[PDB]
Amino acid sequence: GSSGSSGISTEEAAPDGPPMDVTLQPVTSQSIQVTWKAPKKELQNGVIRGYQIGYRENSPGSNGQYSIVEMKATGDSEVYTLDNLKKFAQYGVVVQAFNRAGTGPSSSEINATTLESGPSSG
């Protein structure tokens, strides 16, 4: 209990739609960048407390269960660098907006095969 909520809304509601601009982007070798935008405006169903980024290997032998990661909505646009990944391997993650009112549906499962090498300045 630190910050309340005031914005013509005495009660929020779970999102009835996934986030937009949902896409992956390999920045390193064992990590990927997930960027997305606010889920619609009318669907937003009130401000958002945060979203869930579930990612899991795209191969057999992986834990399986989509590793969920709780975060906060910095603003309209949000991003999350999913680290602890494999090397040059396909990975599928989803993004969903979750508020105090509840959680919403996920976004079209995307993918992004991590780079085939480590990072390099330039």
Curated annotation (Swiss-Prot):
Q: In which tissues is it expressed?
A: Detected in heart, liver, pancreas, skeletal muscle, kidney and in brain, in particular in the amygdala, caudate nucleus, corpus callosum, hippocampus, substantia nigra, thalamus and subthalamus.
**Where are glycans found on this sequence?**
N111
Compartments it resides in? Cell membrane; Synapse
Which ranges carry the Fibronectin type-III domain?
A: 18-116
Binding partners and assembly: Homodimer; mediates homophilic interactions to promote cell adhesion.
Q: What is the annotated role of this protein in its UniProt record?
A: Cell adhesion molecule that plays a role in neuronal self-avoidance. Promotes repulsion between specific neuronal processes of either the same cell or the same subtype of cells. Promotes both isoneuronal self-avoidance for creating an orderly neurite arborization in retinal rod bipolar cells and heteroneuronal self-avoidance to maintain mosaic spacing between AII amacrine cells.
What protein name is recorded for this chain? Cell adhesion molecule DSCAML1
What's the encoding gene here? DSCAML1
Whole-protein coverage range: 979 to 1087 of 2053
